[PDB]
Structures are given as structure tokens and as C-alpha cells.
Amino acid sequence: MLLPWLILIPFIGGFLCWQTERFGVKVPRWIALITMGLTLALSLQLWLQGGYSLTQSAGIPQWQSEFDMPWIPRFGISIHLAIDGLSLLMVVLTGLLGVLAVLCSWKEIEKYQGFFHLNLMWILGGVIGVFLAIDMFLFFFFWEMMLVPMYFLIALWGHKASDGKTRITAATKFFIYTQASGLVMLIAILALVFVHYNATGVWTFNYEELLNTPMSSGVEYLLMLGFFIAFAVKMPVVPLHGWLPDAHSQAPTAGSVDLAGILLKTAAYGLLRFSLPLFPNASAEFAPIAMWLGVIGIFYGAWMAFAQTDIKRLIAYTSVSHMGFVLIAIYTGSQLAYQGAVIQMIAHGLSAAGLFILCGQLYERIHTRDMRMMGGLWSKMKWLPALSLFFAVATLGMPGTGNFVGEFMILFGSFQVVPVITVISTFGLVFASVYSLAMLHRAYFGKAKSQIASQELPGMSLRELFMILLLVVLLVLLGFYPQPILDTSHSAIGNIQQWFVNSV
Amino acid sequence: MNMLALTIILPLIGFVLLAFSRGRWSENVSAIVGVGSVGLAALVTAFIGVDFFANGEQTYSQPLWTWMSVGDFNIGFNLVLDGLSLTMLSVVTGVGFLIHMYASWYMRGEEGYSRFFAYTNLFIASMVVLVLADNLLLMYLGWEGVGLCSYLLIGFYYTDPKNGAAAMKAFVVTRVGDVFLAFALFILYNELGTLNFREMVELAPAHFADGNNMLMWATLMLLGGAVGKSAQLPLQTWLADAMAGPTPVSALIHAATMVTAGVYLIARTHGLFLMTPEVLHLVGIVGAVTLLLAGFAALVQTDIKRVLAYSTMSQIGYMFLALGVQAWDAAIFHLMTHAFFKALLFLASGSVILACHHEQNIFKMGGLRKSIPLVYLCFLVGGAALSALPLVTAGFFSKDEILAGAMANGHINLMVAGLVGAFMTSLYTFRMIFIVFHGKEQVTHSLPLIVLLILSTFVGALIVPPLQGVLPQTTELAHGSMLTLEITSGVVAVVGILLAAWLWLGKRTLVTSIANSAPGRLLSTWWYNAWGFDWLYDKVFVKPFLGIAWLLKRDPLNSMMNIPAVLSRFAGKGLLLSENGYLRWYVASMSIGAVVVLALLMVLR
Ligand SMILES: CCCCCCCCCCCCCCCCCC(=O)OC[C@H](COP(=O)(O)OCCN)OC(=O)CCCCCCCCCCCCCCCCC
Ligand SMILES: CCCCCCCCCCCCCCCCCC(=O)OC[C@H](COP(=O)(O)OCCN)OC(=O)CCCCCCCCCCCCCCCCC
Ligand SMILES: CCCCCCCCCCCCCCCCCC(=O)OC[C@H](COP(=O)(O)OCCN)OC(=O)CCCCCCCCCCCCCCCCC
Ligand SMILES: CCCCCCCCCCCCCCCCCC(=O)OC[C@H](COP(=O)(O)OCCN)OC(=O)CCCCCCCCCCCCCCCCC
Ligand SMILES: CCCCCCCCCCCCCCCCCC(=O)OC[C@H](COP(=O)(O)OCCN)OC(=O)CCCCCCCCCCCCCCCCC
Ligand SMILES: CCCCCCCCCCCCCCCCCC(=O)OC[C@H](COP(=O)(O)OCCN)OC(=O)CCCCCCCCCCCCCCCCC
């Protein structure tokens, strides 16, 4: 019922942001703010009225809300939306990150702010549609429609200090990676649909109907490989990862594009929702390769993050390492590891959002991003180094922050499954602490290594400090009280885990 | 007794207020907030102890909420209070209050006053979380928070990069220890299904009746986490380097909080270590070797803070030796007494540093007894308690209990190592005392020094921790055996002090002869650098890490997946050569395609 409005309110808001630019240059930011305010209010209303804490696991499918409309009846294609605990959590996270993205670009008084705002809303609507669609063609449609505004924002509104050609190259590389992976996913979807059509005789793209599809061993492996290649590009999983630091480096200076669609983890939701239930035996066979890819991703991202002289690339490689942790969690087949994966994705979204916002503020003050041109900024700034210290301690897995809770539940479930990957991942956590301390001391501690870092800098604004402290409060409350988030997603995790382990 | 959570709430409130003050408050107001938060923490601890002794030493449990509940994985936010928890809580709160008062005097005129007090208040709150936790995950929360506060306080002077490097080393080595502790947590939850200490002890022997390898592994990783936190073998190298922080930070880390967490972890999970005797024997061996190496390192050192650091390392080795000989009560008693006299020694060392206009070399120092009598008497009684001077100091009674517990349990070599370590302890302690305080001259802070002065004497040994019914009783020694053991320990301490007076109180003529000899300089260079452990961990863990980072800084996998892009570019550039614009070549290509199509149709027919 409210799911089509949840998807369509960003699109109508973006159209109104573009159209209301003639009323004034300061108008579209307010329109975008009310748009994500209404979206977040609807998401919280769905959270309150869903009764997710009292919902028990009944088996796939089990949706707390559901909408259906025929879209292409020739192929049996429908606009078919469904929300449950995991999808509702990611929709709430999408709404909150969109609110933060609108609030982060409040000072842009550019003459074409309407198109920037419209592209931001179209990105957010695409992410919401990805999290809500349970039709394969519709899910793929959202998966690929959310990339065009990201491309145009990176290419046209990106890093102004860098050359234009670097922005074009980064946007084109990101688009090529994501769309080629999406086309491989579309081939896998089409082959699965044709297998189901040959088995039964009905045209369908609905994910509930494609679950009970008899596939030979090896065909299911190929379909799982196509799905996993798409999700591994978007997660990212090594070596399908360089698009993420390249796009983060040439992103807009405010950082709203990072918060809009890049930092929201749709690929692991696709792995939990689509890769494991549709192909359970193939995923059980693929689990060692995927989890060793996760181990390699954790250590590779840690070694890249330690070696970066740039803050944005550093945080991108932190994202690579944490997504390696989540990838290890997904193929365990454990309820505890899955709940820890959900907590880890939410906490990583919050922590990386705070880190990227603070990096944007720091670049605004000091007009550079190289870590060799700064140092000793604790005495030159009022609020920024302490909040950046809090977020850097958050991403190394410190208790009191939700990252520790998510990573430790992941490792508990994984050790209940496999010990060696767990112990290597915990040494990866040591590596994560290493790169966090390296970033902290190259950025804010020591003596000034240039001239711009030796001058006093203006403090952060009240709205910006308000949203940063809101992120701080949310991370602390997730670290100390993660229970409502756990009972929200307990039914979906239970259904996915029971389908994965009862069909292998 | 219901105010058990206030001992965390008050330091947390103080930390939050002093962090969000951002130095805008006055130094008097910031000092009042910080030392008042720790003072009401100590006062609530005193009321808790009064109610605990009035209730007949009953173990108290106060749940607050459930931290996580995922199926069988149930971790709660519950605090527990037994005799051991009360002992460590009283030690942390009282010694931290005294250190906070001395810091309120000491940090005057310094930048970062409120930041310092907020970090110390968070340190105190995290230690109360550590010592009050009833399950392993809450104790891990306190463990990691204590490590974070130690990292934040070691590199307090952020302008000097050496402090930052020391903070990195401390946090990285302690994080490796915490990862080993995490391994222990994972094994224990996988085998027993719970992390509560009582429940783990209850369901351990029923589950481990057939196989004991997993419990042995869990206790081994518990020992690894303990030696990571307590600066023992093989994770001890961070202490000396991370000694670059302020004096109250050093006193809080070395006496009150940080190095006693491993001892508390071994004593709290003593049942699991009791059903795995080889791991407990390894605890004893690790403590003996660590105390011997720490004594030999402190013998030849030229920095007073570093000497006190290796003295603290030797005392934690003594506590680990006491834990390895199942002398748990002796270990906790030595923890309390060592906290008292090490806090006194560190605060008096800070007074000496301030009086000697920021000089930290002992050989530059000389004749400070005449300049400052009170600090000299502080150093005298602190070194007498550290060297176990008989019948007047609490350290003598603590080490006597440790050695009697080692002797009564049939551990002969550990007792011999303890006697040798006591000899070397008196040696380096009075060596540094005689070098600093003898030779040729070249109400806020007095009260904690006086309180620690009283507590470093036999009055500190008059306090007995209520560990009966929590930790098992040590086996009793014979009257003649304990008498000759006390006589031997006193004789060893007096002989060490007298030979230190023979060597360093007068002109160091034969000492220079050993120092300048080739085997003497070899041994001095070996013991000065902590037996090459820091060099080994630099060449085995740091340098290959830096080399791999330098090799991978160009992202080889990115180039590996960019190889198809350059292949496509090269193929397109090569294929564009066919578009030369010549019509005759176009007709020739059409005829070539006709030949190819016809030949392919004839072959495949
Ligand atoms: C896990 C592996 C198996 C599954 C793979 C699934 C496919 C998706 C994930 C892999 C995608 C790899 C894409 C690599 C190229 C990325 C795009 C890129 O780098 O574009 C920038 C580049 C131009 O940049 P620049 O050099 O600055 O230009 C100035 C020169 N005049 O542009 C160029 O140089 C031209 C780019 C041409 C188009 C891109 C190359 C297409 C190659 C085939 C794509 C399908 C993948 C097939 C398998 C490849 C091998 C794994
Ligand atoms: C560059 C990017 C794209 C990659 C290249 C393009 C895709 C390549 C796909 C190669 C597939 C090779 C298949 C080889 C065997 C074919 C014959 C066969 O065994 O057919 C079996 C079956 C037809 O017999 P049937 O009676 O229908 O039995 C039903 C069985 N469940 O067959 C069926 O029912 C249909 C079988 C479909 C198999 C899956 C095809 C798509 C899989 C996803 C994409 C490829 C894998 C991922 C990417 C790899 C790296 C790029
Ligand atoms: C311009 C130039 C540059 C750009 C272009 C570069 C090249 C692009 C094209 C690359 C891909 C080529 C085709 C790869 C797929 C081949 C499929 C195949 O041979 O399938 C055979 C068989 C089919 O299964 P079948 O036996 O029919 O099962 C039914 C009865 N059991 O299959 C099986 O039985 C299962 C076989 C599984 C292993 C084969 C698939 C490997 C996929 C490699 C990529 C993914 C690796 C894993 C993930 C890494 C990280 C993402
Ligand atoms: C680790 C340190 C020691 C712990 C205290 C501080 C922790 C961090 C403070 C911020 C986060 C707090 C999150 C929890 C707040 C209380 C809400 C709560 O958990 O309620 C649950 C419980 C009632 O529900 P019940 O069913 O009994 O619980 C089982 C759960 N299904 O509720 C009850 O039974 C009542 C519990 C009351 C607890 C009051 C604690 C006040 C703490 C003030 C701290 C101020 C500074 C905060 C920031 C510090 C730095 C991060
Ligand atoms: C829980 C009990 C203990 C158990 C172990 C817990 C371990 C994990 C704890 C996580 C919390 C964060 C710890 C580290 C924070 C360090 C922040 C810091 O350094 O603050 C000091 C700084 C003022 O220092 P100063 O240099 O004087 O000022 C800047 C120059 N003008 O301050 C500032 O500049 C302003 C304040 C900056 C941020 C302070 C900390 C924020 C996070 C904690 C509070 C969150 C909000 C409270 C409510 C939560 C929800 C109930
Ligand atoms: C002890 C015996 C048992 C073994 C247990 C496991 C290993 C324990 C290792 C203990 C010693 C660790 C020492 C770490 C020192 C860190 C501080 C330091 O040296 O900082 C200097 C430098 C600062 O960084 P930056 O700002 O970039 O400056 C560049 C310098 N010009 O920063 C650096 O140079 C970065 C240093 C990174 C250190 C990474 C450590 C990785 C540990 C991996 C553990 C593996 C466990 C398994 C081992 C094999 C078992 C078979």
C-alpha cells in the first residue's frame, strides 16, 4: 500500500525540485528536505505499524506488506513490492542517509541545483526500489536505473579541484562495472525464468514463483555465479572493487552522492534475499570460494587503506574490508552470523556516512585531501577532530559502537561454522585498528606539515554539528542497545536461514 | 548496594561533561568535575563495601538490560559483585581518586585539562565495567574501552610524534591480545553456549567429560589475552615505549588499572584454568620468565619512568607466578599492595620530574634528598615496599604469601625464580634510588602522597581482601618451612639492598669496569633493548607489513581488471586500420568476405 508511495515520493520530489528552481535558487533544497522527511516519516510509520518484533519465522515467502500491479503481462512481469523486517530496516537507513545527504549540500547555491537535487532523489528512489522489489525484472530495473544519476552527479557536479577528465573516467568506470555486472545478472535471471518456463509452462518473473524451480547441478551454479558477479561488483568484492575508490575520489565535495546510493549496501541484501534462497545448493557449494574472497577482501582493503595518502580512498577501502566481513557472514548459514551481518551493514553505513561527511567538512576548511599536507589539526579546529576520532574508533570495531556488535556476532556465527576464516578475520580486525590509527595520526596529530594546516579554521555550523551528533547518538545507541534492530529483522533472517539449511 | 551502576554512571557523566566543555570551563571547574566524579565513585564504592560486609559477603547481581538476544546467543547487561570484584573496584576507585587529585595539582597550566580528565574518567568507567561484568562479552567491552583510553592517554601530548607512535604500539599489541581473548570467547560460547562466569564453570565439566582439547585451547587464548593486557610474554614490548605519557597516566595504567586486568581475568575464570592444569602451569612459567626478564631489563636502564615500567612488569610477573601456583588470594593481595606502592612511586617520580625541570636521565640527577625531603621519603618507602623490605612494608607480606603458596604446592623452580627476581628487584630499585638521590647536586598533591605513604607501609598489608568463598584457599605451609622462607626472603632483600649500596652509593669504580667491558657492554645493550623483543617484532611483523603496503599501494587487482580495457583499446586501434578510406580495398574486403563465407559454407555442409 505505502510501498509504491515510498518509491514514488522521491521521484515526485525530484521533479518538484527541478521545477521549483524558477521560484528561487534556495527553494529546491527545502523541497528535497521535505521529500526525505516524508519518506523517513513513512518508513518509521511502517516500522511502528508492522509489528516486526512479534513476527515469527514462517518460511519464505512471508511479507509484512505487499503490493502488486501488472507491468508487462506478456512476460508475466509485475510491479511487485514487498516489505519485511530486513527490507524495512534498509528502507529506514536509506531514508536517514538521504536526509543526511540533503542536509549536507545545504550551502550549494549553484545555478543548476535543481538537477543535482533531482538526481539525488532519483538515486534514493532507485535504492528504495531495489530494497522493495520482489520481482526480478523490477529489481534489475531499479538496480540499473539508480546508476544514471550517480554517473551524471559524479561527472558534472563532482570534485571541482580535480580535472574534468578524471571525473569522467571515474564515472564511466563505475557505470561500466555496475552495468556489465547487471547485464550478467539479467542473463542469469532470463535463464532461470526460461528454466522455470520449460519446467512448468507459465511466464513469470516473480521471486516467490521462481523459488520452487527444479534445476540441475551446474546450471544452478551458473545462475548463482551471475547473481554473485553482479553483487560482487556492487558490494564490492575483490577484484571488482577499484570503481569504489575511483568514484569516491571524484565524488562531489559535499559527500551527498556517497550517502545517496554508494554507501547503501544493496548487494548484500541481494545476496541474502536472492542468491541464497533461489540457489541454496549452489551457494552451499560456493561458500568456501566466497568466504575466502571475503578474507582476501578484508586484508586487501586493510592494506590499501593503510597505504592511502587520501582520506576518501582510505574510507572506501574501509568499506571494502567491512563488506568482506559481511560477505564472510552471508555464506555461513548461521542465524547469529546473519543478524550480525545486518547489524554490521547498518553500523557501517552510519559510521562511513559520518566519516565521509567529516572528510567533506575537513576538505572545506583546509582545501586539500592529501594527508601529507596536514597534521596537528586538534589545536586548529573546535569540533571536527574529536568527532573524526569517535568515528575512526567506531570503524575499528570498538564496543559501545554498533560495528563491534555486528562484527562480533558475525565472528561468533562463523566460528560456530568454520574456525579458520574466523581467526583470520579477527586478525583482519587488528589490521582495521591499524589503519584507523594511521589515518587518525596522519590527519589530526603531530605538527603542521604545510602552511594551510598551521592557521586557525572556522568551526562547523549548527546544522552540520547537529547531524553529526545525531549520527554519533545513533551509533552509540546501536552499540549499547541493538535489540530492537535484532527483533525487527529476526523473522526475515530466520526465514532465509531455514530456507538455506533445509534445502541443502 | 543498589548503586552499583553509579560507579559507572558518575565517571561517564564526568567524561561527557568534560568532553563537551571543550576547555571553555575554568581549570578549577574542570578539576572539580573530574575529581568529584571519581570521588563520588569512590564514595559509592565505600558504601557498597559497607553494605557488602553488612550482608555477610553475599554475591550481588544487578541486571540492567539484555545486550543481545539472537536465539541461544543471550548476552545480558548485568553487573556482579563478589569479594574479588569489590577488591578490584575499591582499588581502582580509591587509587584513581588519589591519582586524580595529584593530576588536578599536576596538570595545572597545561593545554587539554578537560580532555585529560575526560579520558581518565572514561578510563575509570571502563575499568569498573571490566571488574563488575558477569559475562565475558561485557568484560570484553570494558577490556576494549580500557585499551582505547590507554591509547588516548599515552599519546596525550599529540604535538610530539613519538607519543603517537607509542600510542599506536600500545593499541596494536593490546588489540592482538584482545583478538586472542576473542578467540577464547568464541571457543567458550561454541562449546558451552554461555559466557557468564558462573554458568561457564557449572557446565564446563559436564560438556568436557570426553574431550578436553577445546577447553585447553580456550584457557590458552584466555592466557594470551591476559598477557596481552598485562604486558607479559610475548606481548610485553608496548609498556616501555608507551611510557612517554604523563605521570598520572603512568600511575593509572601501571598501578590502578591497566596491567591488573589480566590478573583479574585469570583469577575470575579460575575454574576453567583449574580443570586445565597445564595451562595454569604455563601461566606460572610465563610469569616467572617475564619477571626475570623485566628485572634484568630494569637493572641497566637510565630512565626512571622506564625503570618503574619494568618494575611494574616484574610485579605483574610475580602475580602471574602466584596465579600459576594456585595462590589466587596471594595474587590479589599483591595486586592491591603493588597498586598502592606503584602509585606512590609514580606520583613521587612525577614530583621529581617537576622538581628537576623536565630531566628524565637518572645519571644527570644527583642529590635530590636535600632539595625535596618529602618526595625523597616517598621514594624511600615506595622502593622499600617494592623491594619487599621485611616487617615494615606490605610488599614483604605480599611476596611472602606468593612464595609460600609456590612452595606449599610443590613448585620449587618457580619459588627459586621468585627469590632471584626479588634479589634483582631490590638491586635495580635501590640502584636507581641511590643514583638519583645520592651524589653531588647539579594540600592538593600532598594528601594523596601521604595516603599512599601510609598505604605502602604495613598498614596496606593490614587490609585483607574478602576473597574467601570466591577464590579457593591456598594450601598451608609448615611453620618451620614458612619461617625459613620468610627468613630467606628477608635475607635476600637485605643482601640486595646492601650490595646495591656497595655498588652505586659510593663511587662506581667496579660498576664502570663491568659496564665498559666487552661482555658487559654486550649484556647491557641486550638488556637495555628488552632482550631484542621489540627488534624481533619490528623485523617480523612491522617491516613485512610496511613492505606489503608499499608493494600494494598501486592496487594490482585494479590493473588486473583494467587489462581488458587496454585490450579493448588496442583491438579497436588495430581494427581501425582497416578503415583506410580506399575504395579498392573495400571491394577487396567484400571479395575476401565472399570467399570466407563460401568456404565456410562448403566446409560445414
Ligand atoms: C569476475 C570476473 C568475471 C566477471 C566480469 C563481469 C563484468 C563486470 C566487472 C568487470 C568490469 C571490468 C571493466 C574494466 C574497464 C572499466 C572501464 C574503464 O576503465 O574505462 C576508462 C577507460 C578510459 O580511461 P582513460 O584511459 O583515462 O582514457 C584516455 C585514453 N584515451 O575506458 C577505456 O579504456 C575503454 C573501455 C571500453 C569498455 C570497457 C571494457 C569492456 C570489457 C568487457 C566487459 C565485460 C567483461 C568480460 C570479462 C572480462 C575479463 C574478466
Ligand atoms: C561476458 C558476460 C556473460 C558471460 C557469457 C554469456 C553466458 C555464458 C553461459 C554459458 C552456459 C553454458 C551451458 C553449457 C551446457 C548447455 C547444455 C545443457 O546442459 O543444457 C541443460 C539445460 C537444457 O536442458 P533442459 O531439458 O532444459 O534441462 C533443465 C536443466 N535444469 O539448459 C538449461 O536449462 C539452460 C542452462 C542455462 C545455463 C546458465 C546460463 C547463464 C548463466 C549466467 C551467466 C554466465 C555465468 C556467469 C558469468 C561467467 C563469467 C563471465
Ligand atoms: C574483448 C576481450 C576481453 C573481454 C572479454 C573476455 C572474455 C569474456 C567471457 C568470459 C566467460 C567465458 C565463459 C565462462 C562460462 C563457461 C560455462 C561452461 O563452460 O559451462 C559448462 C558447464 C555447464 O553445466 P552443465 O554441465 O551443463 O550442468 C548440467 C549438468 N550438471 O559448467 C559447469 O558444469 C560449471 C562450471 C563452473 C566454472 C566455470 C565458470 C567460471 C566463472 C569465472 C568467473 C567467476 C569466478 C568466481 C567468482 C569470482 C569473483 C566474482
Ligand atoms: C557500559 C557502561 C554502564 C551502563 C550505563 C551506560 C551505557 C551507555 C549509555 C547510552 C546507551 C544506553 C542504552 C540503554 C538505555 C536504557 C534503556 C534500556 O536498555 O532499557 C531496558 C530495560 C527495561 O527493559 P527490560 O525488558 O528490563 O530489558 C531487557 C531488554 N529486552 O531498562 C531498565 O531496566 C532500566 C535501565 C536503566 C539504565 C540507565 C543508564 C543511564 C546511563 C547514563 C549515561 C550517560 C552518558 C551516555 C554516553 C556515554 C558515552 C558513550
Ligand atoms: C561506557 C563506559 C565505558 C566502557 C568503554 C566504552 C568505550 C567506547 C566509548 C565510545 C565513546 C567515544 C570515546 C572517545 C571519544 C573522544 C572524544 C574526545 O576526544 O573528546 C574531547 C573533545 C574536547 O577536547 P579538547 O581538545 O579540549 O577540545 C577540542 C579543542 N577545542 O571533545 C569535543 O571536542 C566535543 C565532544 C566530542 C565527542 C565526545 C564523545 C562522543 C561519543 C560519546 C557520547 C555520545 C552522546 C551521548 C548520548 C548517547 C545516547 C544516549
Ligand atoms: C608476540 C608473539 C606472538 C605473535 C602475536 C601476533 C603479532 C604481535 C606483534 C606485536 C608487535 C606489533 C608492533 C606494532 C607497532 C605499531 C606502531 C608503529 O611502529 O608505528 C609506526 C608506523 C606509523 O605509521 P605512519 O604514520 O604511516 O608512519 C610511517 C613511518 N615512517 O606504523 C607502522 O609502521 C605500522 C605497523 C603495523 C603493525 C601491524 C601488526 C600486524 C600483526 C599481525 C598478527 C599476525 C598473527 C599471526 C602471526 C603468524 C603466526 C603463525
Ligand SMILES: CCCCCCCCCCCCCCCCCCCC
Ligand atoms: C535503521 C536505523 C537504526 C539507528 C540506530 C538505532 C539503534 C537502536 C536504538 C533504540 C533506542 C534506544 C534508547 C531508548 C530505549 C527505550 C527502551 C524502551 C523499553 C524499555
